Amino acid sequence: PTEQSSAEVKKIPTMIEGFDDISHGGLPQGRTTLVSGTSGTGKTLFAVQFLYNGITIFNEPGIFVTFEESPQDIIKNALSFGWNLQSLIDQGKLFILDASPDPDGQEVAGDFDLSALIERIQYAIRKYKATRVSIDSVTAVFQQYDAASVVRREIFRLAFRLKQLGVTTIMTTERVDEYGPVARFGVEEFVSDNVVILRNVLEGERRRRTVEILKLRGTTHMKGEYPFTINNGINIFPLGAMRLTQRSSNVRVSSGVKTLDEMCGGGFFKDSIILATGATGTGKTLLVSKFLETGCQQGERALLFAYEESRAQLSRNASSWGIDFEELERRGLLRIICAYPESAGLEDHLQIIKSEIADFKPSRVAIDSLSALARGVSNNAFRQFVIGVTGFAKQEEITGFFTNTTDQFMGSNSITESHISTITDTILLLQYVEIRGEMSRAINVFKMRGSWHDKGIREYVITEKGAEIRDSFRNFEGIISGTPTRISVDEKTE
Amino acid sequence: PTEQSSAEVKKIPTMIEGFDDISHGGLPQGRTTLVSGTSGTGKTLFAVQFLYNGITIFNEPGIFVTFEESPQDIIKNALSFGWNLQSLIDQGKLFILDASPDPDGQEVAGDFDLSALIERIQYAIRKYKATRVSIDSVTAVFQQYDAASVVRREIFRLAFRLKQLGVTTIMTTERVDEYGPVARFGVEEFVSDNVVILRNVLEGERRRRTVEILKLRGTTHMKGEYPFTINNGINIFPLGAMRLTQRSSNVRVSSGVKTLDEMCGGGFFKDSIILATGATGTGKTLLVSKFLETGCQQGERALLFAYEESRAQLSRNASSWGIDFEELERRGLLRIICAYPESAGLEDHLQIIKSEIADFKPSRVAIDSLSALARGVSNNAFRQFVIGVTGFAKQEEITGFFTNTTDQFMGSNSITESHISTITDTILLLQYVEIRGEMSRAINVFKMRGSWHDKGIREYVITEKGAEIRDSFRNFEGIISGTPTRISVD
Numbered sequence: 001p002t003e004q005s006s007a008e009v010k011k012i013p014t015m016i017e018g019f020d021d022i023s024h025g026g027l028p029q030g031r032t033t034l035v036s037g038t039s040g041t042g043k044t045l046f047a048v049q050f051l052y053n054g055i056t057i058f059n060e061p062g063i064f065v066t067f068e069e070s071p072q073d074i075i076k077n078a079l080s081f082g083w084n085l086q087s088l089i090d091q092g093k094l095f096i097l098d099a100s101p102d103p104d105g106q107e108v109a110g111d112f113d114l115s116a117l118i119e120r121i122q123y124a125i126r127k128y129k130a131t132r133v134s135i136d137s138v139t140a141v142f143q144q145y146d147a148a149s150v151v152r153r154e155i156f157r158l159a160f161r162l163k164q165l166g167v168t169t170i171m172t173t174e175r176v177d178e179y180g181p182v183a184r185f186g187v188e189e190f191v192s193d194n195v196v197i198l199r200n201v202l203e204g205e206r207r208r209r210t211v212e213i214l215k216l217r218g219t220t221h222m223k224g225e226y227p228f229t230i231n232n233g234i235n236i237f238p239l240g241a242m243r244l245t246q247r248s249s250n251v252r253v254s255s256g257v258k259t260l261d262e263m264c265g266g267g268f269f270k271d272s273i274i275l276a277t278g279a280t281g282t283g284k285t286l287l288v289s290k291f292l293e294t295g296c297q298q299g300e301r302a303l304l305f306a307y308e309e310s311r312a313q314l315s316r317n318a319s320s321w322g323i324d325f326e327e328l329e330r331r332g333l334l335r336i337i338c339a340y341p342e343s344a345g346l347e348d349h350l351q352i353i354k355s356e357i358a359d360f361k362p363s364r365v366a367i368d369s370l371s372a373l374a375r376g377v378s379n380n381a382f383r384q385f386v387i388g389v390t391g392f393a394k395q396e397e398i399t400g401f402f403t404n405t406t407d408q409f410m411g412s413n414s415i416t417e418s419h420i421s422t423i424t425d426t427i428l429l430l431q432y433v434e435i436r437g438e439m440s441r442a443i444n445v446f447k448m449r450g451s452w453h454d455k456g457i458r459e460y461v462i463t464e465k466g467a468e469i470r471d472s473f474r475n476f477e478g479i480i481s482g483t484p485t486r487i488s489v490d491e492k493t494e
Numbered sequence: 495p496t497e498q499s500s501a502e503v504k505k506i507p508t509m510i511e512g513f514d515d516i517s518h519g520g521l522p523q524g525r526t527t528l529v530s531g532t533s534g535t536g537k538t539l540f541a542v543q544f545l546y547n548g549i550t551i552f553n554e555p556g557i558f559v560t561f562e563e564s565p566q567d568i569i570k571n572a573l574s575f576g577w578n579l580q581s582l583i584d585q586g587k588l589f590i591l592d593a594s595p596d597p598d599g600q601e602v603a604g605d606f607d608l609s610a611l612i613e614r615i616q617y618a619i620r621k622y623k624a625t626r627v628s629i630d631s632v633t634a635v636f637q638q639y640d641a642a643s644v645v646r647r648e649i650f651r652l653a654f655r656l657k658q659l660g661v662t663t664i665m666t667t668e669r670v671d672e673y674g675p676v677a678r679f680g681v682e683e684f685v686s687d688n689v690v691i692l693r694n695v696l697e698g699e700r701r702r703r704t705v706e707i708l709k710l711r712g713t714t715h716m717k718g719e720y721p722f723t724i725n726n727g728i729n730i731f732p733l734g735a736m737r738l739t740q741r742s743s744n745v746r747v748s749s750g751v752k753t754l755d756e757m758c759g760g761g762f763f764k765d766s767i768i769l770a771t772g773a774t775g776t777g778k779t780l781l782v783s784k785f786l787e788t789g790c791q792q793g794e795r796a797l798l799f800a801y802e803e804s805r806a807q808l809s810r811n812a813s814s815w816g817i818d819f820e821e822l823e824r825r826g827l828l829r830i831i832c833a834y835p836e837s838a839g840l841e842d843h844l845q846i847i848k849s850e851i852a853d854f855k856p857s858r859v860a861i862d863s864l865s866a867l868a869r870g871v872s873n874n875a876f877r878q879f880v881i882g883v884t885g886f887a888k889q890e891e892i893t894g895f896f897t898n899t900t901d902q903f904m905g906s907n908s909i910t911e912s913h914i915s916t917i918t919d920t921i922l923l924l925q926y927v928e929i930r931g932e933m934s935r936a937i938n939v940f941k942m943r944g945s946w947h948d949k950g951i952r953e954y955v956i957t958e959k960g961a962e963i964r965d966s967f968r969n970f971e972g973i974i975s976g977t978p979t980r981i982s983v984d
C-alpha cells in the first residue's frame with residue numbers, strides 16, 4: 001500500500017503554509033521549479049521562504065542568487081516578516097550571492113561570460129554544502145538583445161548543471177500580462193520541469209492574489225488557481241484541502257431570547273452556523289446583540305464583525321434594548337470590529353477574521369450582514385468567502401451567527417439571493433406581515449439540522465425588553481406572501 | 495496503374511483509453527500525427543503512452559526521440575504511472591534517441607539537423623525493427639531557424655522519410671495560446687496529415703483538459719473537444735459516445751420508509767436514478783440516510799459523497815433519527831467521502847467518484863447535493879458531469895440517489911433550475927406548505943418511468959424516528975403555491 005512502486009519522483013517540503021497541500025508534498029527534489037508572476041506578486045518572497053524554511057526546519061543550507069536587489073536589501077526586507085537572514089549568513093547556513101551588475105560597464109557582449117556564475121554558484125554549493133538554491137530575477141540577465149532561442153538554451157544549461165549537484169532550485173521569472181504567456185519570452189515554461197504561477201488580478205478595483213501549479217513533471221498536483229495572502233510569509237489557503245472533517249456535538253447554547261430557545265428545542269447548537277435573514281428594519285441586528293450578550297453573561301468572549309454600523313451607533317441602539325456594549329468592551333468580553341466591506345478584498349477580509357479570532361479566542365462570533373459583503377463581488381468569490389468563514393468557525397468550535405438582508409421586503413420567495421442557505425445549519429426567517437393596514441413582524445425557525453424546532457410563523461414585537469415573541473396567525477392565509485387573507489369563516493365554533 | 499490500395503486508409507490502435515473511439519479506430523498508419531498543446535497538457539505522455547502500449551500489448555518496437563528532456567528523466571517520470579521503461583529498453587523493444595545538444599554551447603551546426611538526424615533515426619528503426627516512432631518537442635530544434643518557411647520544409651522532409659520506412663509517427667509541438675494558432679510558426683497544421691490538439695483551458699479558477707482531433711486526412715474522426723483526465727496516463731472520457739447501451743430490470747429495492755415504498759408501488763428500481771428535490775431543511779439528506787442505511791441492513795455496501803456536511807455532523811444528525819452510521823463503517827458496508835466542491839474540477843470529481851466505485855463496488859450510491867457541485871460552473875459542464883455519473887451507475891447496475899436544493903422555498907415552478915430532471919428515472923418532490931400559520935411539509939413522487947406511483951401530495955413529519963408520511967391535504971387548493979386555501983363548500 002504505497003503502492004505499485006517506485007523510486008520515481010519525490011518532493012522536498014517547502015513549509016510554505018498551504019503549498020505542500022496543493023503540490024501534494026512540495027517541490028520535486030533535484031529539479032528546478034519556475035515561479036512566474038507580474039510586479040509585486042510574491043516571487044522574490046517565495047524564493048527566500050523556500051530557503052529560510054529549509055534552514056530552520058530541516059537544517060538544509062541554502063544559496064540565494066540575486067541579479068538585481070542588493071544582498072543588504074534582501075536581508076532588510078525580510079525583517080518585516082520577523083526573521084533575520086544575517087544570523088544564518090553568520091552561521092554559514094545561508095549564502096547570498098551578488099550577481100548584480102556593477103553600476104558601470106562594460107557591458108559586455110552577451111553580458112556575462114556565464115560558466116561562472118555557473119562555476120560561482122557551483123563553488124558556493126560545494127562550500128556551504130547546500131541542497132536548496134533560489135535564483136531571483138533570471139529574466140533581468142537576458143534582455144541585452146536575446147531572441148527566444150538563446151534564452152531557451154541558457155536556462156537549460158543552468159537547470160542541467162544544478163540538476164547534477166542534486167539541488168532543488170527555484171527560478172524566478174517576470175510576466176507582463178496577467179493571463180497571457182507564462183513568462184516573458186514564451187519559452188521558459190516549456191523548458192522547465194516545474195512551473196508555478198503567482199498572479200495579482202484586479203476585478204473591480206480590488207486585488208486578488210492567486211497561486212497555481214501549471215505542471216509538475218513525473219508527479220501529481222492540485223490544479224487551478226488558489227487564493228493566498230502575504231502575511232507571515234506566503235499564506236495559501238486551499239479552498240478545497242480544508243478537510244471536510246470538523247467535529248459535532250449535542251451541546252446547546254441560548255440566543256438570549258427565552259421563547260426563541262423553546263422554538264429551537266433548547267436553543268442553538270454550540271457546533272452550528274446560524275443565519276438570521278429577512279428584510280430591513282426587521283431586527284436582525286437585535287438578535288445578534290442578544291446572541292453576544294448572553295455569551296458575556298456566561299463569562300465567555302464574544303466577537304462582532306460589523307460592516308454597516310459603528311460602535312457608538314451600535315452601542316446606542318443596543319442600549320435601547322437594555323444591553324451595554326460599552327462596559328462589555330472595556331472588560332475584554334466583547335470586541336467589535338467595524339470595517340467597510342469595500343475597504344479590502346474578501347480574501348483580505350477573511351484573514352482579519354481568522355487573525356482576530358485566534359487573538360481574541362472567542363466562543364461566539366457574529367457577522368452583521370454577510371449580504372453587505374456580497375456587494376460588487378462575484379457570487380463565486382462571496383460563496384467561497386462564506387465557506388472559508390463558516391468552515392473555520394466550525395473547525396474551532398465557535399458558534400457562528402450571520403445576518404442577511406434580503407433586497408426584497410414582502411413576498412420574497414427566496415431565503416437568500418446569493419444562495420448560501422445550504423452552508424448553514426440553522427436558519428431564522430424574519431419577515432413583514434400586513435395585519436389590518438399595519439406592518440407586523442413574524443419569526444420562523446426555518447430549519448434545525450439536528451433538532452426539533454417550532455413550525456409556527458409567530459408574531460413578535462420589538463420593545464425595550466427586546467424581542468417579544470407571541471402566537472402565530474392562525475386565522476390568516478398567505479402569511480409568507482406578506483399579504484395575508486383573513487379567513488375567520490368557516491367560523492367552525494358552535 | 496492497377497489501383498492497388500485497396501479499401502482506404504488504415505489505423506493502428508493507440509490503446510490510450512477513449513482515444514480510439516474519438517479517432518474512429520486510432521491513428522492513420524504510416525503517417526505522422528501532430529500532437530500540439532501548451533505546457534503541461536500531456537504531449538509527452540501521449541508520445542510515451544503511444545510507444546508503451548505499442549510494446550506491452552502488440553509487441554511492436556518503438557523509438558522515442560528527445561531533444562530536450564533526457565532519457566533518464568523520461569524513464570523516471572514514466573515511473574509515476576508504474577511504467578517500467580528500462581526493462582523494455584533491456585529487451586530491445588524500446589530505444590530512446592538522445593538528440594539533445596551540448597550544455598557547453600554551439601550554433602552553426604543546427605543545419606546538420608535532419609540531414610544527420612534522419613540517418614540516425616532510420617538506423618535505429620532498422621536496428622530495433624520499430625513500427626512506432628515518437629518525436630517529442632520537434633519545436634526545440636527550431637531556433638526560430640530562418641523564419642517559418644524553413645520550418646515548413648524541415649517538418650515535411652522528416653515526415654516523408656518516416657513514411658518510406660512505414661512507421662507511425664507522433665510529433666509533439668508547443669503552443670502559447672489555448673485558442674490561438676495550433677502551433678508556433680502557424681505552418682505545422684497544413685504540412686502534417688493529422689492534427690491532435692491538447693488543451694488546458696482556464697475558465698474560472700479550475701483547469702479543464704480537453705483533447706480534439708482537428709483533422710485526419712483520408713479518414714473519419716469525431717469532431718470537437720473531448721474532456722480527459724490524467725491518472726494511468728491520458729484517460730479520455732468520450733462522455734458523448736458511451737452509446738445508450740445499458741441493462742434494465744424490474745427488480746425492486748426498499749427506500750427505508752415503508753409508506754414511501756407503497757407510494758412508489760413497491761419501492762425503487764435497482765436500475766434507477768432517484769432524484770430528491772426541495773427547499774432547505776425539507777429532508778433530502780434524511781431520505782438519503784435512510785436509502786444508504788437500508789442497503790447496509792441487507793449486507794450490501796453503500797457509498798456516500800458529501801459536499802456540504804462532515805462525517806461527524808452527518809453521524810450526529812443521523813444518530814438523532816435513530817440511524818447509527820458508526821456501525822456501518824464498522825461492518826465496512828458504508829463509506830463516507832466528504833469533499834469540497836471547489837477542491838477540484840468536475841472532471842476530477844467524476845474520476846474520483848469512479849475510482850471509489852472500482853475500489854468498493856457499491857450496491858447503492860448517493861451524492862448529497864448535486865446543486866452544490868453546480869456552483870460557479872457552466873450548466874453545460876454540469877450536465878456533462880451528471881450524465882457521466884448517472885450513466886456510470888447504469889453501466890454497473892448501481893442504484894443512484896441524488897439530491898438537489900431549490901433556491902426558492904415556495905412558489906417554485908420547476909424541479910431543478912439546472913434542467914437535469916429529464917435524465918432522472920425517479921423524482922420525489924419535497925416542499926413547504928403553509929397550513930394555519932405554520933410550516934408543514936409535503937412529499938410527492940413526481941414521476942417513475944417503469945412503475946405506478948401515488949399521485950398524492952402527502953403531509954410528512956420528521957421525528958426522532960425519521961419521516962412519518964401521513965395524509966394528503968384533501969380540503970385545500972394551491973398546495974403547490976406553498977400558500978394553500980381552505981375550501982369547504984364541499
Ligand SMILES: Nc1ncnc2c1ncn2[C@@H]1O[C@H](COP(=O)(O)OP(=O)(O)OP(=O)(O)O)[C@@H](O)[C@H]1O
Binds near residue numbers: 039040041042231
Ligand atoms: N510584512 C509584509 N506584510 C504583508 N505584505 C508584505 C510584507 N512585506 C512585503 N509585502 C508585500 O510583498 C510584495 C513584494 O513581493 P516580493 O518583493 O517578494 O516579490 P516581487 O515584488 O514580485 O518581485 P519583483 O517585483 O522585484 O520582481 C509587496 O507588494 C508587498 O505588498
Ligand SMILES: Nc1ncnc2c1ncn2[C@@H]1O[C@H](COP(=O)(O)OP(=O)(O)OP(=O)(O)O)[C@@H](O)[C@H]1O
Binds near residue numbers: 464
Ligand atoms: N427602542 C425601540 N423600541 C421599539 N422598537 C425598536 C427600538 N429600537 C429599534 N426598534 C425596531 O428595530 C428595528 C431595527 O432592527 P435592527 O437595527 O436591530 O436590525 P435591522 O434593522 O434588521 O438591521 P438593518 O439596518 O441591517 O436592516 C427598527 O425598524 C425598529 O422598528
Ligand SMILES: Nc1ncnc2c1ncn2[C@@H]1O[C@H](COP(=O)(O)OP(=O)(O)OP(=O)(O)O)[C@@H](O)[C@H]1O
Binds near residue numbers: 220536540
Ligand atoms: N502520476 C500522475 N498523475 C496525474 N497527473 C500526472 C502524473 N504525472 C504527471 N502528470 C501530469 O502530466 C503533466 C505533464 O505532461 P507531460 O510532461 O507528459 O507533457 P507536457 O507537459 O505537454 O510536456 P512539455 O510541457 O514539457 O512540453 C503535468 O501537468 C502533470 O499534471
Ligand SMILES: Nc1ncnc2c1ncn2[C@@H]1O[C@H](COP(=O)(O)OP(=O)(O)OP(=O)(O)O)[C@@H](O)[C@H]1O
Binds near residue numbers: 775781815958
Ligand atoms: N430530531 C429531529 N426531530 C424533528 N425534526 C428534525 C430532527 N432532526 C432534523 N429534523 C428536521 O430535518 C430537517 C433537516 O433535513 P436534512 O438535514 O435531512 O436535509 P436538508 O436539511 O433538506 O439539507 P439542506 O442542508 O440542503 O437543507 C430540519 O429542517 C429539521 O426540521
Ligand SMILES: [Mg+2]
Binds near residue numbers: 044045
Ligand atoms: Mg525581489
Ligand SMILES: [Mg+2]
Binds near residue numbers: 284285308368
Ligand atoms: Mg442591521
Ligand SMILES: [Mg+2]
Binds near residue numbers: 537538630631
Ligand atoms: Mg513535453
Ligand SMILES: [Mg+2]
Binds near residue numbers: 779
Ligand atoms: Mg442536507
